């Protein structure tokens, strides 16, 4: 059972109440218990950002209490304030019913809403609940004349500890992530401009490992660190695989064949010492041997993997017994097993639509499902010929999770917001570290 809690605080930071969110179906059972308010009806809404600090209110363009919570949660971008009964396509998903405060200054509420969820596109984990000074006329934009923000609490997933690493840029869109255990460095790359950030896993300190923009370095997708500490970078529509030295210098840019519509997506270093590289547009798997010789290792046109619209093969892993590759086809949601010795291809399972980055830990496979805003967990059979979906974790809210890396006994996932590229992402961009579940 998914559940979350917001400790509601006043302007001075004192805890004055709490709201509880419990998943029931596709909606949420909400209870609010707060004291110390003025009696009457108070606007109450789920706001887009999980920040109960001052920030700019667009109505006056000045900093206001709880302004950093942003506007009302608006998963459909309706940009229209309406009733708690309006479908999200026409009104803010965060438009919840007003809080009634009795004469003793205590507010209680208990309602169910299908406009919000703890998972998926309507998910409100790491968003916020704001109680206002005035009543909500459920009509006037942007907030129904609810006026000043009087109480606010960040919605936090119950029973789960996570750690965020925040990035500095306005369009970072971190896509790939990798980890140098000897250096204690997390690397993450920008899908937008190719910059590689370095993150000290212990302190959280962020630096630029290498600025993007040069040949083979305009886009950075899937990332891996090899035993020598070199960073391998899938190059997207550049059609390249690029390699950086531990010092941050470009060692090589490797080209794939100049056939139309390249999209080099992700990669993995198998126990055999070879890298295997997915292309989500062209039906081919590339291999880069220890000699940095890149070949078109498997033509998928003969196999049962059929390419279609959107992203095809993308996340990829190698079984630690050296026998297979596993690769997820995002658009069909199929997980494929590829025999490294014979190049035979076998469907493992389906049910993984929007499956993106893979992370294999023995017979446990973690799968970011980007549009679904979860990390799925799959249990595989010993021959890797079949699997079962055992859990889907929204953690504490994931805005388009893309790829995964092992950091000690933890995992780290990028919140890529790739569905907002060219649009209006939330800032800061962040990576999220969490225990294997």
- Binding to Cu ion by CB under 5 A, coded x per residue (else -) over 229-268, reads ----------------------------------------
Interaction between residue 337 and Zn ion (CB under 5 A): no
Residue 151 interacting entry, from Cl ion, Zn ion, Ca ion, none, C-beta within 5 to 8 Å by type: none
Q: How many CA atoms lie within 13 A of 210 on its CB side?
A: 25
| Neighbouring C-beta atoms of residue 198, cutoff 10 Å | 18
Least distance between Zn ion and beta carbon 111 (Å):
16
> Residues 6 or more apart from 422 whose CB is under 8 A from it?
none
Distance of CA 131 to the CA centre of its chain: 28
Do the Cβ atoms of 173 and 418 come closer than 8 Å?
A: yes
Closer to Cl ion by CB, 142 or 229: give it: 142
Interaction between residue 48 and Zn ion (CB under 5 A): no
Interaction between residue 47 and Zn ion (CB under 5 A): no
The stretch near Cu ion (CB under 5 A) out of 128-136, 184-192, 334-342, 401-409 is 128-136
Do the Cβ atoms of 313 and 303 come closer than 8 Å?
A: no
Least distance between Zn ion and beta carbon 424 (Å):
17
Interaction between residue 354 and Ca ion (CB under 5 A): no
Closer to Cl ion by CB, 150 or 279: give it: 150
Spatial CA neighbour of 208 closest among 181, 161, 248: 248
Residue 130 interacting entry, from Cu ion, Zn ion, Ca ion, none, C-beta within 5 to 8 Å by type: Cu ion
The stretch near Cu ion (CB under 5 A) out of 19-27, 123-131, 294-302, 409-417 is 123-131
Residue 327 interacting entry, from Ca ion, Cu ion, Zn ion, none, C-beta within 5 to 8 Å by type: none
Residue 393 interacting entry, from Cu ion, Zn ion, Ca ion, none, C-beta within 5 to 8 Å by type: none
Closer to Cl ion by CB, 117 or 146: give it: 146
| Contact set for Zn ion, span 78-97 (CB under 5 A) | 81, 92, 95
Interaction between residue 175 and Zn ion (CB under 5 A): no
Interaction between residue 130 and Cu ion (CB under 5 A): yes
Do the Cβ atoms of 218 and 238 come closer than 8 Å?
A: yes
Least distance between Cl ion and beta carbon 80 (Å):
14
The stretch near Ca ion (CB under 5 A) out of 17-25, 184-192, 261-269, 390-398 is 261-269
Least distance between Zn ion and beta carbon 80 (Å):
8
Which of 88, 96, 240, 314 binds Ca ion (CB under 5 A)? It is 314
Interaction between residue 155 and Cu ion (CB under 5 A): no
Show the 3-state SS of the chain.
CCEEEEEEECCCCCEEEEEEEEEECCEEEEEEEECCCCCEEECEEEECCCCCCCEEECCCCEEECCHHHCCECCCCCCCCCCCCCCCCCCCCCCECCCEEECCCCCEEEEEEECCCECCHHHECCCCEEEEECCCCCCCCCCCCCCCCEEEEEEEEECCCCEEEEECCCCCCCEEEEEEECCCCEEEEEECCCCCEEEEECCCCCEEEEECCCCCCCCCCCCEEECCCCCEEEECECCCEEEEECCCCCEEEEEECCCCCCCCEEEEEECCCCCEEEEECCCCEEEEECCCCCEEEEEEHHHCCCCCCCCCCEEEEEECCCCCEEEEEECCCCEEEEEECCCCCEEEEECCCCCEEEEEEECCEEEEEECCCCEEEEEEECCCCCCEEEEEEECCCCCCCEEEEEEECCEEEEEECCHHHCCCCCCCCCEEEEEECC
Residue 34 interacting entry, from Cu ion, Ca ion, Cl ion, none, C-beta within 5 to 8 Å by type: none
Least distance between Ca ion and beta carbon 60 (Å):
41
Closer to Zn ion by CB, 71 or 239: give it: 71
The stretch near Ca ion (CB under 5 A) out of 88-96, 242-250, 281-289, 350-358 is 350-358
Closer to Cl ion by CB, 143 or 196: give it: 143
Indicate if the alpha-carbon torsion angle 52, 58, 59, 63 is positive or negative.
Answer: positive
| Contact set for Zn ion, span 94-153 (CB under 5 A) | 95
Which of 9, 42, 45, 157 binds Cu ion (CB under 5 A)? It is 45
Residue 314 interacting entry, from Cl ion, Ca ion, Zn ion, none, C-beta within 5 to 8 Å by type: Ca ion
| Contact set for Cl ion, span 124-163 (CB under 5 A) | 143, 146
Residue numbers of the site for Ca ion (CB under 5 A)?
A: 265-266, 314, 356
Residue numbers of the site for Zn ion (CB under 5 A)?
A: 72, 81, 92, 95
Residue numbers of the site for Cl ion (CB under 5 A)?
A: 143, 146
Residue numbers of the site for Cu ion (CB under 5 A)?
A: 45, 130
């Amino acid at each position: 059972p998914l559940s979350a809690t917001a400790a509601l605080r006043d302007g001075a930071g004192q805890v004055v109440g709490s709201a509880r969110f419990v998943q029931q179906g596709a909606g949420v059972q909400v209870t609010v218990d707060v004291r110390g308010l003025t009696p009457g009806m108070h606007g109450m809404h789920v706001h887009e950002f999980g920040r109960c600090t001052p920030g700019v209110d667009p109505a006056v363009n000045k900093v206001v209490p709880f302004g950093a919570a942003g506007g009302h949660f608006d998963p459909s971008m309706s940009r229209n304030h309406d009733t708690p009964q309006t479908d999200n396509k026409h009104g803010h998903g965060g438009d919840t019913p007003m809080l009634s405060v009795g004469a003793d200054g205590v507010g209680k509420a208990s309602f169910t809403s299908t406009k919000i969820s703890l998972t998926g596109e309507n998910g409100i984990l790491n968003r916020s609940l704001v109680i206002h000074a005035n009543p909500d006329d459920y009509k006037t934009d942007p907030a129904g004349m609810s006026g000043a923000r009087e109480r606010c609490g960040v919605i936090v997933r119950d029973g789960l500890s996570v750690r965020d690493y925040a990035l500095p840029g306005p369009v970072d869109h971190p896509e790939g992530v990798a980890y140098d255990a000897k250096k204690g460095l997390i690397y993450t790359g920008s899908a937008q401009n190719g910059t590689i950030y370095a993150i000290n896993a212990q302190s959280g300190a962020v630096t630029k490992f290498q600025e993007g923009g040069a040949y083979g370095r305009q886009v950075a997708l899937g990332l891996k660190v090899d035993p020598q500490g070199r960073l391998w970078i899938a190059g997207g529509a550049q059609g390249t695989v690029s390699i950086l030295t531990p010092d941050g210098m470009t060692l090589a840019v490797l080209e794939t064949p100049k056939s139309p519509r390249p999209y080099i997506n992700d990669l993995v270093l198998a126990p055999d010492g070879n890298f295997y590289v997915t292309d989500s547009s062209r039906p081919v798997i590339f291999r880069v041997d220890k000699a940095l010789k890149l070949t078109a290792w498997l033509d998928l046109a003969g196999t049962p993997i059929k390419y279609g619209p959107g992203v095809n093969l993308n996340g990829i892993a190698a079984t630690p017994d050296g026998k297979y590759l596993l690769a997820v086809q995002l658009n069909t949601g199929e997980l494929w097993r590829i025999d490294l010795k014979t190049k035979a291809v076998k469907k493992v399972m389906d049910g993984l639509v929007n499956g993106d980055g893979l992370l294999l830990d023995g017979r446990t496979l973690y799968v970011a499902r980007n549009k679904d805003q979860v990390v799925a967990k799959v249990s595989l059979s010993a021959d890797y010929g079949s699997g079962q979906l055992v859990a889907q974790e929204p953690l504490n809210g994931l805005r388009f999770p893309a790829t995964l890396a092992k950091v000690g006994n933890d995992l780290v996932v990028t919140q890529a917001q790739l569905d907002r590229i060219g649009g209006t992402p939330e800032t800061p961009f962040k990576l999220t570290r969490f225990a294997k579940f």
